[PDB]
Design a protein around this ligand. Structure first.
Ligand code: ZN
Length: 44
């Protein structure tokens, strides 16, 4: 956390992948479309 810690969660919807933000779910999903994938096998 470089000097500054400039982080404000203005948007409710956040990307569980990177942490992005969005005003409406529909908006977030669109950004998740690319994230979608099969990483880290052996999931439960
Ligand atoms: Zn993301």
């Amino acid at each position: 956390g470089s000097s500054g810690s400039s982080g404000t969660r203005e948007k409710p919807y956040e990307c569980s992948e990177c942490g992005k933000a969005f005003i409406r779910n529909s908006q977030l999903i669109v950004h998740q479309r690319t994230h979608s994938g099969e990483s880290g096998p052996s999931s439960g």
